[PDB]
Design a protein around this ligand. Sequence first.
Ligand SMILES: C[C@@H]1C[C@@H]([C@H](O)CC2CC(=O)NC(=O)C2)C(=O)[C@@H](C)C1
Ligand SMILES: [Mg+2]
Ligand SMILES: [Mg+2]
Ligand SMILES: [Mg+2]
Ligand SMILES: [Mg+2]
Ligand SMILES: [Mg+2]
Ligand SMILES: [Mg+2]
Ligand SMILES: [Mg+2]
Ligand SMILES: [Mg+2]
Ligand SMILES: [Mg+2]
Ligand SMILES: [Mg+2]
Ligand SMILES: [Mg+2]
Ligand SMILES: [Mg+2]
Ligand SMILES: [Mg+2]
Ligand SMILES: [Mg+2]
Ligand SMILES: [Mg+2]
Ligand SMILES: [Mg+2]
Ligand SMILES: [Mg+2]
Ligand SMILES: [Mg+2]
Ligand SMILES: [Mg+2]
Ligand SMILES: [Mg+2]
Ligand SMILES: [Mg+2]
Ligand SMILES: [Mg+2]
Ligand SMILES: [Mg+2]
Ligand SMILES: [Mg+2]
Ligand SMILES: [Mg+2]
Ligand SMILES: [Mg+2]
Ligand SMILES: [Mg+2]
Ligand SMILES: [Mg+2]
Ligand SMILES: [Mg+2]
Ligand SMILES: [Mg+2]
Ligand SMILES: [Mg+2]
Ligand SMILES: [Mg+2]
Ligand SMILES: [Mg+2]
Ligand SMILES: [Mg+2]
Ligand SMILES: [Mg+2]
Ligand SMILES: [Mg+2]
Ligand SMILES: [Mg+2]
Ligand SMILES: [Mg+2]
Ligand SMILES: [Mg+2]
Ligand SMILES: [Mg+2]
Ligand SMILES: [Mg+2]
Ligand SMILES: [Mg+2]
Ligand SMILES: [Mg+2]
Ligand SMILES: [Mg+2]
Ligand SMILES: [Mg+2]
Ligand SMILES: [Mg+2]
Ligand SMILES: [Mg+2]
Ligand SMILES: [Mg+2]
Ligand SMILES: [Mg+2]
Ligand SMILES: [Mg+2]
Ligand SMILES: [Mg+2]
Ligand SMILES: [Mg+2]
Ligand SMILES: [Mg+2]
Ligand SMILES: [Mg+2]
Ligand SMILES: [Mg+2]
Ligand SMILES: [Mg+2]
Ligand SMILES: [Mg+2]
Ligand SMILES: [Mg+2]
Ligand SMILES: [Mg+2]
Ligand SMILES: [Mg+2]
Ligand SMILES: [Mg+2]
Ligand SMILES: [Mg+2]
Ligand SMILES: [Mg+2]
Ligand SMILES: [Mg+2]
Ligand SMILES: [Mg+2]
Ligand SMILES: [Zn+2]
Lengths: 50, 98, 251
Amino acid sequence: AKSKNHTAHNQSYKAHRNGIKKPKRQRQASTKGMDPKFLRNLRYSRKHNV
Amino acid sequence: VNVPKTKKTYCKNKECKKHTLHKVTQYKKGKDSLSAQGKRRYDRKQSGYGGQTKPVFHKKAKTTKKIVLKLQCQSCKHYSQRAIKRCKHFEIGGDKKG
Amino acid sequence: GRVIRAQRKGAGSVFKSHTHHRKGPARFRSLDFGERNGYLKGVVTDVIHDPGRGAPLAKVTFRHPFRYKHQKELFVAAEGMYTGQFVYCGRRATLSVGNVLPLRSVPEGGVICNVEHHVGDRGVFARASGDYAIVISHNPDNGTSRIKLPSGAKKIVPSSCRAMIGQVAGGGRTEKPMLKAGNAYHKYRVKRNSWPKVRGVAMNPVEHPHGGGNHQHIGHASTVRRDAPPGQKVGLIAARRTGRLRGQAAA
RNA sequence: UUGAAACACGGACCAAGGAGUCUGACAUGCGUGCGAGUCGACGGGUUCUGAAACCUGGGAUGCGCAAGGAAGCUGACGAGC
RNA sequence: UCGUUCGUCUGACUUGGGUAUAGGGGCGAAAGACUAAUCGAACCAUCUAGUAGCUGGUUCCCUCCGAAGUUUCCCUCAGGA
RNA sequence: AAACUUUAAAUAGGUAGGAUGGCGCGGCUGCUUCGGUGAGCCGUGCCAUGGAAUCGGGUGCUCCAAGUGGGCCAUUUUUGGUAAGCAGAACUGGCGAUGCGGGAUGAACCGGAAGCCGGGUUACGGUGCCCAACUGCGCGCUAACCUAGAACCCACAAAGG
RNA sequence: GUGAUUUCUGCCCAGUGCUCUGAAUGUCAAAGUGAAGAAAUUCAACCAAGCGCGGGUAAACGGCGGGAGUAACUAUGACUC
RNA sequence: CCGACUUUGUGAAAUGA
RNA sequence: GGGCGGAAGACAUUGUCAGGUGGGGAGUUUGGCUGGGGCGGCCAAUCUGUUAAAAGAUAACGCAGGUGUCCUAAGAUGAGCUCAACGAGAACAGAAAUCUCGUGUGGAACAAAAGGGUAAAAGCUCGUUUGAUUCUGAUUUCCAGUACGAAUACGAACCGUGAAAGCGUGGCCUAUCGAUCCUUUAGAUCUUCGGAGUUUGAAGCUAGAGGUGUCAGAAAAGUUACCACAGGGAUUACUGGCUUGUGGCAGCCAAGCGUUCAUAGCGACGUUGCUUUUUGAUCCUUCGAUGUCGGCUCUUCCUAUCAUUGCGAAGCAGAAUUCACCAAGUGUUGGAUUGUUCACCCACCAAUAGGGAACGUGAGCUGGGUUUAGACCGUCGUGAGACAGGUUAGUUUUACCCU
RNA sequence: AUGUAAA
RNA sequence: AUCAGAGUGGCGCAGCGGAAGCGUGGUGGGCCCAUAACCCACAGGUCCCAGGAUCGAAACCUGGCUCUGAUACCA
Ligand SMILES: C[C@@H]1C[C@@H]([C@H](O)CC2CC(=O)NC(=O)C2)C(=O)[C@@H](C)C1
Ligand SMILES: [Mg+2]
Ligand SMILES: [Mg+2]
Ligand SMILES: [Mg+2]
Ligand SMILES: [Mg+2]
Ligand SMILES: [Mg+2]
Ligand SMILES: [Mg+2]
Ligand SMILES: [Mg+2]
Ligand SMILES: [Mg+2]
Ligand SMILES: [Mg+2]
Ligand SMILES: [Mg+2]
Ligand SMILES: [Mg+2]
Ligand SMILES: [Mg+2]
Ligand SMILES: [Mg+2]
Ligand SMILES: [Mg+2]
Ligand SMILES: [Mg+2]
Ligand SMILES: [Mg+2]
Ligand SMILES: [Mg+2]
Ligand SMILES: [Mg+2]
Ligand SMILES: [Mg+2]
Ligand SMILES: [Mg+2]
Ligand SMILES: [Mg+2]
Ligand SMILES: [Mg+2]
Ligand SMILES: [Mg+2]
Ligand SMILES: [Mg+2]
Ligand SMILES: [Mg+2]
Ligand SMILES: [Mg+2]
Ligand SMILES: [Mg+2]
Ligand SMILES: [Mg+2]
Ligand SMILES: [Mg+2]
Ligand SMILES: [Mg+2]
Ligand SMILES: [Mg+2]
Ligand SMILES: [Mg+2]
Ligand SMILES: [Mg+2]
Ligand SMILES: [Mg+2]
Ligand SMILES: [Mg+2]
Ligand SMILES: [Mg+2]
Ligand SMILES: [Mg+2]
Ligand SMILES: [Mg+2]
Ligand SMILES: [Mg+2]
Ligand SMILES: [Mg+2]
Ligand SMILES: [Mg+2]
Ligand SMILES: [Mg+2]
Ligand SMILES: [Mg+2]
Ligand SMILES: [Mg+2]
Ligand SMILES: [Mg+2]
Ligand SMILES: [Mg+2]
Ligand SMILES: [Mg+2]
Ligand SMILES: [Mg+2]
Ligand SMILES: [Mg+2]
Ligand SMILES: [Mg+2]
Ligand SMILES: [Mg+2]
Ligand SMILES: [Mg+2]
Ligand SMILES: [Mg+2]
Ligand SMILES: [Mg+2]
Ligand SMILES: [Mg+2]
Ligand SMILES: [Mg+2]
Ligand SMILES: [Mg+2]
Ligand SMILES: [Mg+2]
Ligand SMILES: [Mg+2]
Ligand SMILES: [Mg+2]
Ligand SMILES: [Mg+2]
Ligand SMILES: [Mg+2]
Ligand SMILES: [Mg+2]
Ligand SMILES: [Mg+2]
Ligand SMILES: [Mg+2]
Ligand SMILES: [Zn+2]
C-alpha cells in the first residue's frame, strides 16, 4: 500500500534485449546548429562553384 | 529596490533603433472596461439563474508581483516596457546608496 | 428538516377551533335608526355559559324595530346582569351597568366593555372575562374618544363607538391554580388542539431549531428577528429585552 | 493473487438459455475498380419472377488536384551531392 | 406468539363507526416514533438497460512468437495517458 | 570521521583500432588573415593486402496495435530499525509465466529448462531397509548413565567450564 | 425556557445574537437629475432599506483568572503586593 | 424589509430651481 | 334632494424591476502522501552535503540544512590595492580606539543555506556607467529526450567600459517560480467589422503583466452512534506466524556485603544467553464474517517445584528457615470488595507455586463489562455532534449431517 | 491610624 | 508523548536592535514623643546556561534547562 515504488531492476534487461540502438553513422554529416558565420560562407561558395 | 528615473536602453521605433534616453514610470493596470467581449460574454452568462458560473479565485499564494517599467524615450514619445524580478518594496529615483 | 409545529398550525388540519357546543357569535346588535337616535328596550332571558369562553353570555330578547318578531341577540355578560333585567340600547340609554351607549355618552372615567372599533362592528375590545376599558378623555372637535384598553394601551376610537357599561363577568377566573394536567386538558379540549406543548429543546434537529445535541440546550441566541422566514421564527420573537422584568420596564 | 490444495471466495447434480455485438466519424494493414481523377450515394427512364437489375446526370456534389496567413491578401520562376 | 409474574382500572381511561391531514408532506405527552410486516423521507410506474476508476463470469482445437510491476505527468497511488 | 582528506585501489565508465582514409593538381567564398594566410567546400587523378582476437545476417526503416504499470526470493554492496519471514535502494539471476531430477515435505537452494518414442552416458544427490546403487576397499577420532550424530539455504545455540 | 411545594436565583452587555434612535458631512442599487459627446457612452452630484457609529437587553446564546509574600515553636494564612 | 415605475386622478401653500 | 351607511384615501394595494436579510429551503464540496486512518509534518515546487556502493541514474515520514527573498548596486567594466591573524612599537591609550614596519596560500570577503571557485581577483576603494537592451532560433539541465524555470554558445543590431586586447544578453556557479480562457498594457502612421465610405467602439497580430505555493495549474466546511452502497485482508482492532527492544527466567567475572572470610547466602560495575503467558514492531492468512473480556464447567498437558517421598549444602546445636538435586505421581481451598484477569485482605491448610491448549472452553451457559439505536451529567464544539470520562435500560438463532 | 510583657 | 508559553531588580511584570524600566520592596534623611502613613533624595540587576550572525542583543534564530498550558480518537 506504499504507493511510492522505484527500482531499475529489469530495466537493463529491457534495454539490452533489443540492443542499445546506435544511430547509423552518416556520410555527409548534418550541419544544423553549426556556426551561422561558417555556414553562410559554406553555402555561398557552393553557390559560386563552376 | 531602487531604479533610476531616466535610463538609456534600446528604442525599437523605426525612427530611433538606437540607445536613447528613456523616462521611467511604473506599470499600473488600466481600469477594467465594460464593453470588452469577455465582459459582455460574462455579463450575459452571469445573468439569469444558476449563480456564479465562471470560477472565482480564492487560494492566493503569492505576496509579490513582477514590476513592469513603462520606459518612454524622449525622442519619439513611444513607450516600451520591461518587467523586473519580483520585489516587495520598489521606488524610482530613491536616494542613492552610500 | 421538516415542517415545524409552529408552521403546521396554519393548515387547519387538526388545529381548527373546537366549536361544536359554542352558542354562536357574542356581539352587539346591528346598529340601526332606532339605536342611532333613541333607545330600544330589551330584556335578558338567560345567562348561559358559553363553552370555550370564560365570560357568560346573556340572551337578550329585543323586539324587532320594524318587523313583527323577536330578536334573540346574545351579549357578553357584564358583571351585574341578571335575568329579567331590562337592558336598553341606543344613545339616550341611561348610564346603567348593562346598557350599551355610544362613547359620546359615557362620561370620562367610566368603565366600559365590548368596545366597538368601527361604528357597528359590534364589540372588539374588553371582552374576555373580567376586563374593561376606561374612557379617559373626549375630543369633540374631531368626534373621537380615548380609552385605556386592558393591555395598558391607549386607543383613540370614534366617539360613536358603542360600549356596554360595567365590566365583563367571570373576572378573577385565572387566579385559581388548575393543579392538574387533567384540568388543563379539559380546558383545552373545548378551545383548540394546543396542549400538551413539547419543549423544542427535547426535539430532534429535523423538526425544531432548538433540537438535538448530547445535552439539551438551544445552542444559539433564542431571540429571533422579526423578518426571519416562517419556520425560523420560533423562540422569543423580536424581543426588546429578556430576563426577569424589574423596575420601570415592568410597568 | 508476489504466493491456492488451502483454515480465501463460487461450485449438490443434470438439461436447455447465457456474455466484445450493431451503428456514425477516423486511422493503419490488405484486396478489388478506375487512376489526376474518382465517386451515380439524392433524383429520373426503365424493369412482365423482382423493394432486384440496367441506363442516365457532374460543366465543377464530396474528397483530391496548392499552400501560407489571424485577416486584408499572396500563391510554388523548374535540383545538386 | 405462549406460560406463570406484573402496570392501570372513574380516570389526561378503554373502545366501534363516520370524518379531517398524503410524502420533503402528514401526525407526533418527542422514541426520528407512526404513515398497511416497508420510514434518518412509504408504495407504484416511468426517465432506465441510470452511472461505477469496484467484485464476479467472459463458451472450440493445433501451431508459432511471447512480456510487465519500470521512467514522466494527472485531486494522482484500486485508475488512466 | 557518511555530511574530513594529501595519497588512493579492484570491479564498473568513455573513445580509437582505416575503404565514411590520405596526397597531388585547379577552382569558389559574401568567412579568415598583414598576406595563398587559413578554414572549408568543389572538380579531377592517383594510391591505400582490408589495418588487433573472436563471433554473426541485421531494428536497417516504418506502420498498427495488445497486455503491463500491486511484485516477490536469493549471493554480494547498503539506509531505518534492537531485530523481523520488516520497510527502502544498487548489479545480476530466478519465481511470477516452468515443467523435470535432488534437498523427506517447500515458487524462486543445488542440477537443469522440455515435441512424441527406442538405445547409451551423466549433472545435483546418493549405495543399511523403506529406495535404484557397496552392509565395498582403506586410515583415524567419538562411547554420549541429556533423545550422541548424521545435507548449501535449513529449521539455531552463546559467554564460559 | 424551567418543570409541584419550601428556599433562592450572585457578577458580566466586551464576544454572538435581538432591539431602539437617526442631527447628519461614513458606506450605499435601479430609477430619476446635470455636464461632455455627432451618438453609443462616460462622468459627477443626489441616493431608500441594510451595514457602520450610538444606547438596552443574560429566567437571550453564553462566561465567571493567575503569581508571590505573611501570625512570636511548626504548620496554615485572617493581612499585604 | 425597502426604493422607483404602475393602477394614479383633483388643487393649495411653503421651500428649490 | 338621482349617493345604501360608514372609515381610510389617491396613501395602502395589485403588476415589474432594483438593493439588504434569508440553513427557513435547494444544490454541491469537504485534496494527496502516510509503516491502518486521524491529528502531526510537507518528505507535492525546490537547493546544497551525505546515504548513493570512485562514470550516469538511484528510494524511504533517512540524515544536516535552505528557498518563495535582497540588490541601480550587492549588475557591467577599467584602474589601483591585499584579506583573517600574528610579532614588535607609538601622548592620554589598557585585552580591545588610531598610526608604522615585518610575516602572512588565504586560515578573510564574496547579501542569504551548504558545497565548489578566486589573491596585480571573483575580495577592498575609486573612475565612467546601464548588456538587468532588441529579434528569432540552437543546445544543455528535467526529460516522454515534452513544456516551464534556469543556464550556455553563436548569429543580426545598437551600446557600455578600457589606451587596447577583450569583457558585458543581470548577481562567482549550483535554488529564488507560473499553462488555456479572461482583463490590462506596449507596437505598426498594420488587418476586420463582410453593401461603399467618413468616425467613436469592438475583435485581431507580436511581446509583456494580473495566478493558480495542491506549485503540468477544480471555484468548495463539518458531522453521523440513525447511517446506505461498490469493494478491500492492496488496510486496522482478535488468533496464529517471523522478531523479542519491553516482560519473565538462568549463567560467567568478582568490587564489596556476609562482626575476621569474594563465592553459606548474596553479588554492584560489565557481560552471555534462554523463553514466548505481556507489550512493542510488522501487516503474512482471514473483511461474499473464524462470534471479541470475564466468570461458571470439565479435561488434558508443561516445569521455570509451593507443598508432599528420598537426598546434598549452611553463617544446619534442637525447632524453624535459606540454596540446590532426580523428580510433574498427588495436591493447590472457603470467602468480603471489583464486571474484572490482575490486586488486596480474613480463615483454614502440608501448601494455598507458576503455566498452555485459537490469550482452551458462547449451536456449553451468563451478558456483569464492552460493542448499535433511548436517556443523563462533566469537559470540548457556535452547531449537527465527540470523549481511550462516569451512569442507567438494552434479542444470545440451528445440529436431524460427517467424524 | 496606632502606643512597655520588662512592675 | 509531542505542540506551544514564560523565564528580565528582593517580589510580580514592562519591553519594536541607540543598550533597563513599571508598581512594590531596600537604603539616608525630614514631619512625629515614637512607629506607620506622607515628603525629599540614594543604590539596582550574571536581561534562564552555551553559540552564531548582526553598524549593534536581553529581543533573530539554534543548541542546554525548569515550570505552565494544550490535543492524545475508531476498535
Ligand atoms: C484573477 C485572474 C484569475 C485567472 C483566470 O481568470 C481564471 C480563469 C482561467 C481558467 O482556467 N478558466 C476560467 O474560467 C478561470 C487568471 O488568469 C489569473 C492571471 C488572475
Ligand atoms: Mg507502483
Ligand atoms: Mg437577475
Ligand atoms: Mg395534542
Ligand atoms: Mg407550558
Ligand atoms: Mg414544556
Ligand atoms: Mg431526543
Ligand atoms: Mg434545522
Ligand atoms: Mg438542540
Ligand atoms: Mg456550550
Ligand atoms: Mg494477499
Ligand atoms: Mg491453512
Ligand atoms: Mg471465509
Ligand atoms: Mg470476494
Ligand atoms: Mg456454496
Ligand atoms: Mg447451450
Ligand atoms: Mg468532380
Ligand atoms: Mg541521388
Ligand atoms: Mg404474555
Ligand atoms: Mg369513544
Ligand atoms: Mg375511536
Ligand atoms: Mg410499518
Ligand atoms: Mg449492462
Ligand atoms: Mg440497473
Ligand atoms: Mg494504459
Ligand atoms: Mg593516504
Ligand atoms: Mg557506480
Ligand atoms: Mg576504459
Ligand atoms: Mg535412457
Ligand atoms: Mg536397493
Ligand atoms: Mg433559560
Ligand atoms: Mg422533565
Ligand atoms: Mg442567572
Ligand atoms: Mg451586545
Ligand atoms: Mg458580552
Ligand atoms: Mg445609482
Ligand atoms: Mg440609509
Ligand atoms: Mg443544506
Ligand atoms: Mg451530497
Ligand atoms: Mg487519503
Ligand atoms: Mg499512520
Ligand atoms: Mg503536481
Ligand atoms: Mg555517481
Ligand atoms: Mg582589476
Ligand atoms: Mg527545453
Ligand atoms: Mg557579445
Ligand atoms: Mg558581483
Ligand atoms: Mg484577450
Ligand atoms: Mg455588415
Ligand atoms: Mg502570465
Ligand atoms: Mg459516528
Ligand atoms: Mg437519537
Ligand atoms: Mg494482507
Ligand atoms: Mg527477550
Ligand atoms: Mg529483558
Ligand atoms: Mg492485519
Ligand atoms: Mg474479516
Ligand atoms: Mg467456529
Ligand atoms: Mg527439573
Ligand atoms: Mg463451540
Ligand atoms: Mg448489558
Ligand atoms: Mg446508546
Ligand atoms: Mg459515553
Ligand atoms: Mg496594631
Ligand atoms: Mg527610611
Ligand atoms: Mg515614621
Ligand atoms: Zn524612440
